[PDB]
UniProtKB/Swiss-Prot annotation, chain A:
The cus efflux system is composed of CusA, CusB, CusC and CusF. This is Cation efflux system protein CusB. Belongs to the membrane fusion protein (MFP) (TC 8.A.1) family. It comes from Escherichia coli (strain K12). GO terms for cellular component: cell envelope; membrane; outer membrane-bounded periplasmic space. The chain holds residues 90 to 385 of 407 of the full protein. Part of a cation efflux system that mediates resistance to copper and silver. The keyword Signal applies.
Length: 296, 297
């Protein structure tokens, strides 16, 4: 009959299965930008760039020159002399932007008057080079590609999930990202999405995850770990401490408010995370004692 | 757009079923063993052609043994059938003997054959397999001391290594499908099952105690046993997979309003399994669709 004790109380609810997962970083094929040629032409310059550097934003990649183009921009040129009604000249200018002449150039042809030489092309978005090293003098064709850039503001980690435990995930907080390379502050997490593709090896769905890269502290192909938390159909819960056995016997403390205790019988369904859930034995609201201590 | 050598399919709500094979190691149940112990001090005789591990067919002899003291009273009583001592007296000692531990089938022989009871054999309780015992000949023993053990085999234990994550999703014996490389044979029926809530700290893994019906006795333990388990999923709208199509960013399939007129409806697949698929969103509970179809542009 002591009372240097602590009170506990039975509760209904689910558990929380921990689970760490292997994750490999990735570049979202969405936050990228490519620069393509308006139409065939030839090249010039090409700066001190390799397949992957750091462009600051809108900056030169290479000058280039185009034949054919000129043929008409000169034909047109004479009309401003041979009194060809405005509508005529205009009709050929659109017939040029058509083929694909930069608008800001045409104003410059019309103003500076001197036919349009070569015209450099600048990188659209800040980012990181990928593909491109081609240089000097090359013959190209229409909308053919010339180079790519990679954005880094958002990033991709793709953990490999078991279908069996798939649909138990429906909120971004179940996830807890972590990285060996960068402990640091946070690993905040934009949005999550699940490619319903069943990697036929182990029944595994690729689980895409756009992560906030601002401080740019991450490259790709790194090592990334995913602490996921799953749950369970709710069951009668009790703190583990307050449970005891050692053999076929399994059960603990009933405490009806009269401060009087009693041996009640419970069969643990499963245990996890320092607390246990009884398949059967107690009642929704019943009170039990954890950390207690008293005599025979 | 008009053929009809087809087959009709109808959308529905419900769960999927996740397959999953698992490693299992057979085992003997520490409940299906028996030990034969002595009633009281005595000495021995015989001891049959048995080794530490044979095949007892059930209730059968292990050895006969001789005991003194026992005699003391069983002779005293023998005179009360001559010296006219009320039936109540005699019977009072017989119980006082079964008390000490006298085989009921032996007393009948004491009363019938009359000849005081020489020695008396002891038989093996349960069908099984001998474990411990090789002791033989003539030996001095004491009271409830042990003599031999046996291992039952009729019920057998297999224990799969289950992940808690998936744990609670199992509540019926039929999800279990047992298979053994060694013995394809007929069935592998499965008495009862149960979970030992001890989380194997390595991988978050429970045990999965399974009592399997070993009748034909075709399984020793330490064997290889595979457990094809099936899980489930919170209910979602289903469609036969045959009746779905894509190949790129497009994903959707046949809507068939009763007018026999079809239409390209757009659906989003949550995941697939076991030959059917489940749409996160897209169609309607009971909308009609076509599997096994086939027609033109
Ligand atoms: Ag449950
Ligand atoms: Ag679903």
């Amino acid at each position: 009959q002591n009372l240097g004790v602590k009170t506990a109380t039975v509760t209904r609810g689910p558990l929380t299965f921990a689970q760490s997962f292997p994750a490999n970083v990735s570049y979202n094929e969405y936050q990228y930008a490519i620069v393509q040629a308006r139409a065939a032409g030839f090249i010039d310059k090409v700066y001190p760039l390799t397949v992957g550097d750091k462009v600051q934003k809108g900056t030169p990649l290479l000058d280039l020159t185009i034949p054919d183009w000129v043929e008409a921009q000169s034909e047109y040129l004479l009309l401003r002399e041979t009194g060809g009604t405005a509508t005529q000249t205009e009709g050929i200018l659109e017939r040029l932007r058509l083929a694909g002449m930069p608008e800001a150039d045409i104003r410059r042809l019309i103003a500076t008057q001197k036919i349009q030489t070569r015209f450099t092309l600048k990188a659209p978005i800040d980012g990181v080079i990928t593909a491109f090293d081609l240089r000097a003098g090359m013959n190209i064709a229409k909308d053919n590609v010339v180079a790519k850039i990679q954005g880094m503001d958002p990033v991709w980690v793709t953990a490999a999930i078991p279908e069996s435990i798939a649909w138990l995930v429906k909120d971004a907080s179940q996830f807890t990202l972590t990285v060996p390379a960068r402990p640091d502050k946070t690993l905040t997490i934009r949005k999550w999405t699940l490619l319903p593709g069943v990697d036929a090896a182990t029944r595994t769905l690729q689980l895409r995850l756009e992560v906030d890269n601002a401080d740019e502290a991450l490259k790709p192909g790194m090592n990334a770990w995913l602490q996921l938390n799953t749950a369970s159909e709710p069951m009668l819960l009790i703190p583990s401490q307050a449970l005891i056995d050692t053999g076929s016997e399994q059960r603990v403390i009933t405490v009806d408010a009269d401060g009087r205790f009693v041996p009640k019988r419970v069969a643990v369904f499963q245990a996890s995370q320092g607390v246990t859930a009884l398949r059967s034995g107690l009642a929704e609201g019943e009170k039990v004692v954890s950390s207690g201590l008293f005599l025979i």
